[PDB]
PDB file of C-alpha atoms in Angstrom:
ATOM      1  CA  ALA A  25     148.718   4.847 146.290  1.00 59.45           C
ATOM      2  CA  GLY A  26     146.434   3.569 143.545  1.00 58.59           C
ATOM      3  CA  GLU A  27     149.270   1.919 141.683  1.00 61.75           C
ATOM      4  CA  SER A  28     150.400   0.326 144.869  1.00 60.18           C
ATOM      5  CA  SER A  29     146.941  -1.059 145.525  1.00 62.88           C
ATOM      6  CA  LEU A  30     146.764  -2.637 142.081  1.00 63.86           C
ATOM      7  CA  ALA A  31     150.303  -3.794 142.291  1.00 64.10           C
ATOM      8  CA  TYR A  32     149.373  -5.341 145.578  1.00 65.52           C
ATOM      9  CA  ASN A  33     146.695  -7.374 143.982  1.00 69.05           C
ATOM     10  CA  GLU A  34     149.236  -8.545 141.393  1.00 63.78           C
ATOM     11  CA  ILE A  35     152.708  -8.857 143.034  1.00 65.03           C
ATOM     12  CA  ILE A  36     154.415  -8.852 146.438  1.00 66.12           C
ATOM     13  CA  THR A  37     154.907  -5.571 148.296  1.00 62.44           C
ATOM     14  CA  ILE A  38     156.739  -5.258 151.640  1.00 61.32           C
ATOM     15  CA  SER A  39     157.635  -2.150 153.615  1.00 62.01           C
ATOM     16  CA  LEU A  40     159.882  -1.213 156.529  1.00 62.91           C
ATOM     17  CA  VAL A  41     159.516   1.929 158.668  1.00 64.74           C
ATOM     18  CA  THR A  42     162.699   2.950 160.461  1.00 65.12           C
ATOM     19  CA  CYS A  43     162.253   6.445 161.946  1.00 68.02           C
ATOM     20  CA  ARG A  44     158.898   7.865 160.988  1.00 67.63           C
ATOM     21  CA  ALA A  45     156.436   7.619 158.127  1.00 66.74           C
ATOM     22  CA  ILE A  46     154.469  10.742 157.437  1.00 68.14           C
ATOM     23  CA  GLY A  47     151.522  11.277 155.165  1.00 70.35           C
ATOM     24  CA  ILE A  48     151.820   9.460 151.869  1.00 70.94           C
ATOM     25  CA  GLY A  49     154.583   7.292 153.306  1.00 76.23           C
ATOM     26  CA  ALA A  50     152.296   6.059 156.049  1.00 77.63           C
ATOM     27  CA  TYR A  51     149.434   5.521 153.679  1.00 77.23           C
ATOM     28  CA  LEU A  52     151.539   3.447 151.229  1.00 79.74           C
ATOM     29  CA  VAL A  53     152.936   1.250 153.982  1.00 76.11           C
ATOM     30  CA  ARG A  54     149.538   0.543 155.261  1.00 77.28           C
ATOM     31  CA  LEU A  55     148.384  -0.048 151.717  1.00 78.04           C
ATOM     32  CA  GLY A  56     151.373  -2.393 151.408  1.00 78.45           C
ATOM     33  CA  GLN A  57     149.862  -4.084 154.406  1.00 78.68           C
ATOM     34  CA  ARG A  58     153.041  -5.834 155.389  1.00 78.33           C
ATOM     35  CA  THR A  59     154.716  -3.494 157.697  1.00 77.75           C
ATOM     36  CA  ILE A  60     157.815  -3.527 159.929  1.00 77.47           C
ATOM     37  CA  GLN A  61     158.340  -0.843 162.570  1.00 76.95           C
ATOM     38  CA  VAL A  62     161.601  -0.132 164.278  1.00 82.32           C
ATOM     39  CA  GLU A  63     161.483   0.672 167.974  1.00 81.14           C
ATOM     40  CA  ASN A  64     161.444   4.446 168.784  1.00 81.11           C
ATOM     41  CA  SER A  65     160.096   5.221 165.320  1.00 79.71           C
ATOM     42  CA  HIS A  66     156.655   6.831 165.062  1.00 76.55           C
ATOM     43  CA  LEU A  67     153.819   6.920 162.581  1.00 78.29           C
ATOM     44  CA  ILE A  68     151.689  10.043 162.248  1.00 78.89           C
ATOM     45  CA  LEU A  69     149.974  12.482 159.941  1.00 78.88           C
ATOM     46  CA  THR A  70     149.809  15.790 161.922  1.00 80.15           C
ATOM     47  CA  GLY A  71     152.112  17.063 164.641  1.00 78.90           C
ATOM     48  CA  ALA A  72     151.604  17.162 168.375  1.00 81.37           C
ATOM     49  CA  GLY A  73     152.075  20.886 168.322  1.00 81.52           C
ATOM     50  CA  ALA A  74     149.154  21.486 165.984  1.00 79.44           C
ATOM     51  CA  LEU A  75     146.841  19.184 167.929  1.00 82.48           C
ATOM     52  CA  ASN A  76     147.855  20.491 171.303  1.00 80.37           C
ATOM     53  CA  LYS A  77     147.412  24.066 170.147  1.00 80.39           C
ATOM     54  CA  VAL A  78     143.896  23.488 168.806  1.00 77.95           C
ATOM     55  CA  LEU A  79     143.008  21.627 172.031  1.00 79.58           C
ATOM     56  CA  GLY A  80     144.566  24.270 174.243  1.00 76.75           C
ATOM     57  CA  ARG A  81     147.025  22.029 176.045  1.00 77.41           C
ATOM     58  CA  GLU A  82     149.970  19.675 175.690  1.00 75.06           C
ATOM     59  CA  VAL A  83     147.894  16.515 175.434  1.00 78.50           C
ATOM     60  CA  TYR A  84     150.697  14.553 173.793  1.00 77.58           C
ATOM     61  CA  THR A  85     154.392  15.103 174.477  1.00 79.59           C
ATOM     62  CA  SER A  86     156.113  12.943 171.852  1.00 78.60           C
ATOM     63  CA  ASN A  87     155.095  11.713 168.424  1.00 79.78           C
ATOM     64  CA  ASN A  88     155.982   8.224 169.727  1.00 76.37           C
ATOM     65  CA  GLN A  89     153.024   8.615 172.043  1.00 77.79           C
ATOM     66  CA  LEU A  90     150.943   8.874 168.891  1.00 74.87           C
ATOM     67  CA  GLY A  91     152.403   6.426 166.363  1.00 76.39           C
ATOM     68  CA  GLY A  92     155.117   4.334 167.956  1.00 75.72           C
ATOM     69  CA  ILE A  93     155.106   0.591 168.192  1.00 74.04           C
ATOM     70  CA  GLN A  94     153.507   1.018 171.594  1.00 71.26           C
ATOM     71  CA  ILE A  95     150.465   2.212 169.654  1.00 72.62           C
ATOM     72  CA  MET A  96     150.530   0.511 166.270  1.00 71.21           C
ATOM     73  CA  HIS A  97     151.823  -2.819 167.515  1.00 70.89           C
ATOM     74  CA  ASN A  98     149.305  -2.738 170.327  1.00 74.60           C
ATOM     75  CA  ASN A  99     146.518  -2.084 167.773  1.00 74.87           C
ATOM     76  CA  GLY A 100     147.673  -4.275 164.928  1.00 75.73           C
ATOM     77  CA  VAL A 101     148.654  -1.443 162.584  1.00 75.98           C
ATOM     78  CA  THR A 102     152.254  -2.708 162.733  1.00 74.55           C
TER      79      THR A 102
ATOM     80  CA  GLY B  28     142.600  22.934 149.573  1.00 77.13           C
ATOM     81  CA  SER B  29     146.140  22.101 150.604  1.00 81.58           C
ATOM     82  CA  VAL B  30     148.806  19.693 151.644  1.00 83.72           C
ATOM     83  CA  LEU B  31     148.443  21.430 155.002  1.00 82.88           C
ATOM     84  CA  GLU B  32     145.834  23.745 156.228  1.00 85.44           C
ATOM     85  CA  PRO B  33     146.843  27.359 156.968  1.00 87.49           C
ATOM     86  CA  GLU B  34     146.982  27.222 160.826  1.00 86.35           C
ATOM     87  CA  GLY B  35     149.463  24.360 160.551  1.00 83.26           C
ATOM     88  CA  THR B  36     151.302  26.201 157.796  1.00 83.37           C
ATOM     89  CA  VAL B  37     151.779  29.231 160.049  1.00 82.17           C
ATOM     90  CA  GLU B  38     152.842  26.991 162.938  1.00 80.68           C
ATOM     91  CA  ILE B  39     155.855  25.811 160.908  1.00 79.34           C
ATOM     92  CA  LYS B  40     156.616  28.710 158.446  1.00 79.56           C
ATOM     93  CA  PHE B  41     155.559  32.067 159.954  1.00 79.16           C
ATOM     94  CA  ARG B  42     157.542  32.759 163.135  1.00 78.44           C
ATOM     95  CA  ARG B  43     158.849  35.815 164.944  1.00 78.61           C
ATOM     96  CA  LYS B  44     161.670  36.460 162.441  1.00 76.70           C
ATOM     97  CA  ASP B  45     159.046  36.943 159.779  1.00 77.73           C
ATOM     98  CA  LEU B  46     157.124  39.234 162.100  1.00 78.94           C
ATOM     99  CA  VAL B  47     160.170  41.422 162.495  1.00 80.16           C
ATOM    100  CA  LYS B  48     160.740  41.374 158.724  1.00 78.69           C
ATOM    101  CA  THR B  49     157.162  42.497 158.261  1.00 78.55           C
ATOM    102  CA  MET B  50     157.277  45.421 160.654  1.00 78.51           C
ATOM    103  CA  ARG B  51     160.517  46.618 159.115  1.00 78.63           C
ATOM    104  CA  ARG B  52     158.850  46.645 155.674  1.00 77.50           C
ATOM    105  CA  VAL B  53     155.352  47.835 156.526  1.00 78.54           C
ATOM    106  CA  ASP B  54     155.013  49.195 160.058  1.00 79.25           C
ATOM    107  CA  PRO B  55     155.767  52.951 159.994  1.00 74.86           C
ATOM    108  CA  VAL B  56     156.671  53.176 163.680  1.00 76.37           C
ATOM    109  CA  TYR B  57     159.119  50.311 163.365  1.00 75.84           C
ATOM    110  CA  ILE B  58     160.643  52.000 160.306  1.00 80.01           C
ATOM    111  CA  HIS B  59     161.000  55.224 162.317  1.00 78.71           C
ATOM    112  CA  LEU B  60     162.746  53.533 165.255  1.00 77.79           C
ATOM    113  CA  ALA B  61     165.045  51.784 162.844  1.00 78.77           C
ATOM    114  CA  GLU B  62     165.711  55.039 161.047  1.00 79.47           C
ATOM    115  CA  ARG B  63     167.012  56.644 164.209  1.00 79.39           C
ATOM    116  CA  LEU B  64     168.935  53.637 165.476  1.00 78.10           C
ATOM    117  CA  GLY B  65     170.308  53.680 161.916  1.00 78.87           C
ATOM    118  CA  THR B  66     171.926  57.042 162.603  1.00 79.79           C
ATOM    119  CA  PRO B  67     175.680  57.323 163.358  1.00 80.46           C
ATOM    120  CA  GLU B  68     176.830  59.129 166.533  1.00 82.41           C
ATOM    121  CA  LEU B  69     173.890  58.394 168.799  1.00 81.43           C
ATOM    122  CA  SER B  70     173.642  58.966 172.522  1.00 80.96           C
ATOM    123  CA  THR B  71     173.562  55.801 174.633  1.00 83.09           C
ATOM    124  CA  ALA B  72     170.265  57.168 175.932  1.00 82.27           C
ATOM    125  CA  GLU B  73     168.674  57.239 172.470  1.00 80.68           C
ATOM    126  CA  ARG B  74     170.197  53.849 171.668  1.00 81.01           C
ATOM    127  CA  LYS B  75     168.906  52.023 174.779  1.00 81.53           C
ATOM    128  CA  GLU B  76     165.604  53.876 174.445  1.00 85.51           C
ATOM    129  CA  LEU B  77     165.185  52.807 170.824  1.00 87.12           C
ATOM    130  CA  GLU B  78     165.882  49.146 171.535  1.00 84.20           C
ATOM    131  CA  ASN B  79     163.233  49.239 174.302  1.00 85.35           C
ATOM    132  CA  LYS B  80     160.778  51.112 172.060  1.00 85.41           C
ATOM    133  CA  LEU B  81     161.331  48.342 169.533  1.00 86.36           C
ATOM    134  CA  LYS B  82     160.525  45.468 171.887  1.00 85.51           C
ATOM    135  CA  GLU B  83     157.409  47.330 173.014  1.00 86.82           C
ATOM    136  CA  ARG B  84     156.287  48.063 169.466  1.00 90.64           C
ATOM    137  CA  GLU B  85     156.761  44.471 168.378  1.00 89.02           C
ATOM    138  CA  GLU B  86     154.885  42.852 171.279  1.00 88.11           C
ATOM    139  CA  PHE B  87     152.032  45.335 171.124  1.00 87.69           C
ATOM    140  CA  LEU B  88     151.888  44.607 167.361  1.00 86.80           C
ATOM    141  CA  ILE B  89     151.823  40.772 167.637  1.00 87.91           C
ATOM    142  CA  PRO B  90     148.040  39.950 167.226  1.00 89.11           C
ATOM    143  CA  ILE B  91     147.212  41.274 163.686  1.00 87.73           C
ATOM    144  CA  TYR B  92     150.268  40.019 161.958  1.00 87.95           C
ATOM    145  CA  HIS B  93     149.591  36.328 162.704  1.00 87.90           C
ATOM    146  CA  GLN B  94     146.203  36.509 160.960  1.00 89.60           C
ATOM    147  CA  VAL B  95     147.792  38.232 157.972  1.00 89.58           C
ATOM    148  CA  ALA B  96     150.309  35.429 157.806  1.00 91.11           C
ATOM    149  CA  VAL B  97     147.738  32.602 157.842  1.00 88.16           C
ATOM    150  CA  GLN B  98     145.703  34.442 155.225  1.00 87.44           C
ATOM    151  CA  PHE B  99     148.782  34.648 153.045  1.00 86.03           C
ATOM    152  CA  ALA B 100     149.429  30.889 153.392  1.00 90.44           C
ATOM    153  CA  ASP B 101     145.824  30.012 152.540  1.00 90.42           C
ATOM    154  CA  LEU B 102     146.102  32.047 149.336  1.00 89.86           C
ATOM    155  CA  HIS B 103     148.422  29.351 147.987  1.00 86.45           C
ATOM    156  CA  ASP B 104     145.724  26.753 148.583  1.00 84.97           C
TER     157      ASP B 104
END
């Protein structure tokens, strides 16, 4: 991450997310700033199961609900 | 501290299979049932009875063993 940040201030970085970027992958793409997201891919840190379990119900049904282009493109993350 | 906190660790890596494994190593009752089912020339009564006794033992046993599992995961962290 750090290297990528510095690198970013010095050279060109570009990143493409095809299926899903999890944890450090997500953070580096965002750090890379320039980000392409394939339809039906999703972009998350922690799984729907874990969150639903802590919250006592199936709030979310699909990781795409959480990180898909319908979220990140609609919020400018993608 | 961890890549993943213990509850989320258990969620992925401490399922039923592991519960069964754990009874067979540690639970005396489970051992006992298995010891008899592990006998040759058993009556179909004793066999069917043992399998039932096993399902009952396992489900009754379910609460404690989840906490032991999460504890175990956290100890890596």
